[PDB]
Amino acid sequence: PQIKLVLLAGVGFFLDAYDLFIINQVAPMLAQVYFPKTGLPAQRQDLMKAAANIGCVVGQVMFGVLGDSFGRKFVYGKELILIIVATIFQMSAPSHWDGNRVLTWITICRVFLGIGIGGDYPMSATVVSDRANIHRRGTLLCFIFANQGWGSFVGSLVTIVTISGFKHRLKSGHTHDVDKAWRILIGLSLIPAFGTLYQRLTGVIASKKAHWQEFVAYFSTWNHFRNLLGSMLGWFLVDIAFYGINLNQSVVLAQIGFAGKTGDVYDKLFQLATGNIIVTALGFLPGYYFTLFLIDIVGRKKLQFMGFIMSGLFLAILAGEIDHIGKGPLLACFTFMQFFFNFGANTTTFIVAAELFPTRIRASAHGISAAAGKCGAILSSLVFNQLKAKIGTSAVLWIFFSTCILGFISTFLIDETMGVDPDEKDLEERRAR
Numbered sequence: 001p002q003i004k005l006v007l008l009a010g011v012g013f014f015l016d017a018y019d020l021f022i023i024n025q026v027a028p029m030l031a032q033v034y035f036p037k038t039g040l041p042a043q044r045q046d047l048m049k050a051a052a053n054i055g056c057v058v059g060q061v062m063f064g065v066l067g068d069s070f071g072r073k074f075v076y077g078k079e080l081i082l083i084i085v086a087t088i089f090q091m092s093a094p095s096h097w098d099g100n101r102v103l104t105w106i107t108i109c110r111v112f113l114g115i116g117i118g119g120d121y122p123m124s125a126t127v128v129s130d131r132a133n134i135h136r137r138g139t140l141l142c143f144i145f146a147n148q149g150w151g152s153f154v155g156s157l158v159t160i161v162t163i164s165g166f167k168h169r170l171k172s173g174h175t176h177d178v179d180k181a182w183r184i185l186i187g188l189s190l191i192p193a194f195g196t197l198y199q200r201l202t203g204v205i206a207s208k209k210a211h212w213q214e215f216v217a218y219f220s221t222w223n224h225f226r227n228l229l230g231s232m233l234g235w236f237l238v239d240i241a242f243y244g245i246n247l248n249q250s251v252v253l254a255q256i257g258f259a260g261k262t263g264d265v266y267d268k269l270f271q272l273a274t275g276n277i278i279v280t281a282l283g284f285l286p287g288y289y290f291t292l293f294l295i296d297i298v299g300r301k302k303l304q305f306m307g308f309i310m311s312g313l314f315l316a317i318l319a320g321e322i323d324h325i326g327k328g329p330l331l332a333c334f335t336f337m338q339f340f341f342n343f344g345a346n347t348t349t350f351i352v353a354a355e356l357f358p359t360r361i362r363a364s365a366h367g368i369s370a371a372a373g374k375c376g377a378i379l380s381s382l383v384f385n386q387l388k389a390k391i392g393t394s395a396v397l398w399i400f401f402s403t404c405i406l407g408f409i410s411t412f413l414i415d416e417t418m419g420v421d422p423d424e425k426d427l428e429e430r431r432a433r
């Protein structure tokens, strides 16, 4: 039936999300091995974490040209082997290498990993926004998207299971085995990746200039232009805070009480992994499901308004209190923030970009919005740990706060898409003039 295809798109998101966010769990292990006394150098850590998102935009433009030039049959398999191969190179950095060289190895691998993650990313959204043509398209897009939560959660679960498996060996003095742990964290993605590879198998300028002419004509009208403006702005603005925080969740949990001077190597990695699992289990993950049950009841806009403005509050509390109040209150607010990312702006920007636009131009408008998002992701990703050193963590969280208020403001540019057919509205718009 139609069901099996949406699951396959789901496992595509799951694998993309796992590979993206697992770097947050891998980085503190790389620190313990290759930079035990100092931290990972700020610029190198930022480059390593932005790498996958940088490749992600290169992927969907490149796999876009090839997919348009020679059709969908050209791309469907090749994107997945690229992330499999990129996973294996990343997994197998020479252990006898110098720390900066190991880091540079992983960043480059993660760019190519990103290029593949850039493959199926918008194509899993289109297949069911085109297919459904029903009020329950939002509940469907949201169900596919929720696999981003499971990607981050399973990575955290994999991490505590892995560390607690190495418990006795680390306690008995074999401290280099954390170099084997971080390879297992990346490597375990290969199990669904190979599973899915097998399941997936078992006048060009004249046309482009004609589509460009329709696109420009469409988005040169205000009530049509602002919907593209608001779609680009909302996705751009939320990804600054969202990927800034989530690619560095282990870093924030370290000003909060979860990193300390007490305890040994196991005690360190294990409470830090304990902090990560709490946040994603209690906040990051359930937010997707609160959205799932309410988008086709409350509407998309009311959920972004709430999402931006609620995550703003907890960012302001973090920014104001992080250096001044105890662990507990901060851990709660940080979890509340994560909850209202996914019960809110992060989930709705994705749906709104897929739902706003009539099909005759939907491909570009969704692509331009997704590209705008990745731009916001790479700014914070490229600079988060550098700013944290130049201006401090509280000052960065004040920046994230401001982007949430701008997101709230920009959401007024959008039409509510709950229950609307964008092709019909385009249709009456035209029969009306």
Ligand SMILES: CCCCCCCCCO[C@@H]1O[C@H](CO)[C@@H](O)[C@H](O)[C@H]1O
Pocket: 082, 085, 086, 089, 100, 101, 102, 104, 105, 108, 109, 112, 113
């Ligand atoms: C599926 C795609 C696979 C991509 C894997 C390519 C890894 C690139 C290897 O990096 C190279 O090795 C050293 C890194 O420390 C440096 O000598 C050199 O500057 C750098 O270019």
Ligand SMILES: CCCCCCCCCO[C@@H]1O[C@H](CO)[C@@H](O)[C@H](O)[C@H]1O
Pocket: 088, 089, 091, 092, 093, 094, 095, 096, 183
């Ligand atoms: C399709 C190309 C795939 C090539 C994979 C070759 C892997 C060779 C083994 O690598 C080794 O991995 C160990 C940790 O796992 C490190 O201790 C060691 O330094 C490194 O040499």
Ligand SMILES: CCCCCCCCCO[C@@H]1O[C@H](CO)[C@@H](O)[C@H](O)[C@H]1O
Pocket: 223, 226, 412, 413, 414, 415
């Ligand atoms: C100098 C900055 C000024 C920009 C002003 C904000 C633009 C608001 C656009 O109004 C729009 O009118 C539509 C009805 O036609 C509503 O459906 C939609 O919700 C609403 O967003």
